[PDB]
Amino acid sequence: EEEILRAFKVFDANGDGVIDFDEFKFIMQKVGEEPLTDAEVEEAMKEADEDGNGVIDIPEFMDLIKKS
Numbered sequence: 001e002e003e004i005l006r007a008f009k010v011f012d013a014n015g016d017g018v019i020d021f022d023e024f025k026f027i028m029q030k031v032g033e034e035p036l037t038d039a040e041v042e043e044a045m046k047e048a049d050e051d052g053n054g055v056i057d058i059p060e061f062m063d064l065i066k067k068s
Contacts, residue, residue, distance in 0.1 A: 004058070004061065004065065007061075008058050008062070009058070011024075011027065012058075013027050017057055018055055019048075020055050021045050021049075021054045024041060028041050047064070048060070050064060
């Protein structure tokens with residue numbers, strides 16, 4: 001819970017428990033202006049979405065890391 005909550009619960013942009021692709025682009029570096037490389041943000045959200053919809057709740061993230 002310290003490991004998985006550390007990474008996903010810090011990443012959760014809205015504070016309700018879900019992350020989307022465009023809000024991942026928002027939280028990527030900043031709070032305001034854009035300072036980017038698309039490859040980092042695109043690779044990270046492709047690795048984290050299990051369903052192909054473009055949204056993530058904590059249960060998805062923890063299954064793709066913790067399965068073993």
